[PDB]
Amino acid sequence: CSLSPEVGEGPYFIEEDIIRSNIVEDRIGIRLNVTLNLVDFNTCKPIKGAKVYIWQPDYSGIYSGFMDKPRVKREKMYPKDPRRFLRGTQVTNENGTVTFETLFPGHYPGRTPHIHYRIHANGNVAHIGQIFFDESTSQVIQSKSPYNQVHSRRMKNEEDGEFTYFNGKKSIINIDPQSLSDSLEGILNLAINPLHRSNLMWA
C-alpha cells in the first residue's frame, strides 16, 4: 500500500469530461478491460468520487485530437481535430474502482506501450501517471493483428526514458493469463495522495 509513482502527463491530455466506460470508438485492436482500484496511501482506504481520465494512442501510435502525423511538442498544445477516441473518464465507486473497456495501446517512436491516466480529487489534480505492461504480455500482443502490421521497433520498458525516470516498475498492470486466450483483463491497484497538487501536467 505504498505510494504509487507519478509519471509525466506528456503533451496530449485534453481536459474534457467524456464519461464513459467503452472508449474504443472506430479504433482497431485487441480488447482490453482495465480495472483501477484507488486507495488513500495514508489509510489504505478506498477513495470514492474521484474522476479518473485515461488516454492512449491507437495501434499505429496516434492520439485523437492530434491525428496530424508530425506532432511537435510546444508550450501551447491544442487539439487540431475533434476526434476523441481512446479517451474517457470514470468516477470511482464505493470500493475506489473504475473499469474501462479499451484496446491494448500502440507504441510510437521513442516510447514503450502505455496508457496515460490523471486523477482529480477534491477539485485538485491529485495524481498523474502511466500504466505499463509486462514484457511477456507485450510480446504476445505484438504477434497479433493488427499490431503485427506495425513494423517499427518496439521500445522496451527498460529503454523508455519515462519508465526509467519515474519508476515505472510500480505501475505495471497485472493481466490475467486466463484472458490471453473475448477480452484481456487487467487490474492495477493504485495508492495516491488525494491532498497532493500534482505539478506533472504539461500546460
Ligand X SMILES: C[As](C)(=O)[O-]
156 binds, among ligand X, Fe ion, none (CB under 5 to 8 A by kind): none
- Annotated ligand binding at 108? The verdict is yes
Nearer to Fe ion, 10 or 186 (CB): 10
Please answer whether residues 173 and 34 qualify as being in contact, where contact means their C-beta atoms are separated by less than 8 angstroms: yes
Partner from Fe ion, ligand X, none binding residue 10, C-beta < 5-8 Å depending on class = Fe ion
Residue 37 pairs in a beta bridge with 97, 189
With contacts defined by CB under 5 A, name the span among 6-14, 41-49, 78-86, 182-190 that binds Fe ion: 6-14
Nearer to Fe ion, 64 or 92 (CB): 64
Q: How far apart are the first and last CA of the chain?
A: 30
28-63 burial, b if ≥16 CB within 10 A, otherwise e?
A: ebbebbbebbbbbbeeeebbeebbbbbbbbbbbbbb
User: Cis bond leading into 70, ω under 30°?
Assistant: no
Which stretches of the chain bind ligand X, using CB under 6 A?
A: 51, 120, 123
Residue 194 contact partner, candidates ligand X, Fe ion, none, CB within 5 to 8 A by sort of partner: none
Residue (61 or 146) nearer to Fe ion, CB: 61
Calpha distance 17→67 (Å, rounded): 20
Which listed option, ligand X, Fe ion, none, makes contact with residue 120 (CB within 5 to 8 Å by class)?
ligand X
User: Which span (9-17, 46-54, 159-167, 192-200) binds Fe ion, by CB under 5 A?
Assistant: 9-17
C-alpha cell at 87: 479517451
Beta-bridged to residue 93, according to DSSP, are none
Lay out the sheet containing 31-40: strands in order across. Answer: 97-103, 31-40, 184-192, 174-175
By CB under 5 A, is residue 105 in contact with Fe ion? Answer: no
**Applying CB under 5 A, does 10 fall inside the site for Fe ion?**
yes
| Binding residue ranges for Fe(3+) | 63, 108, 114, 116
| Binding residue ranges | 63, 108, 114, 116
List residues near Fe ion by CB under 5 A.
10
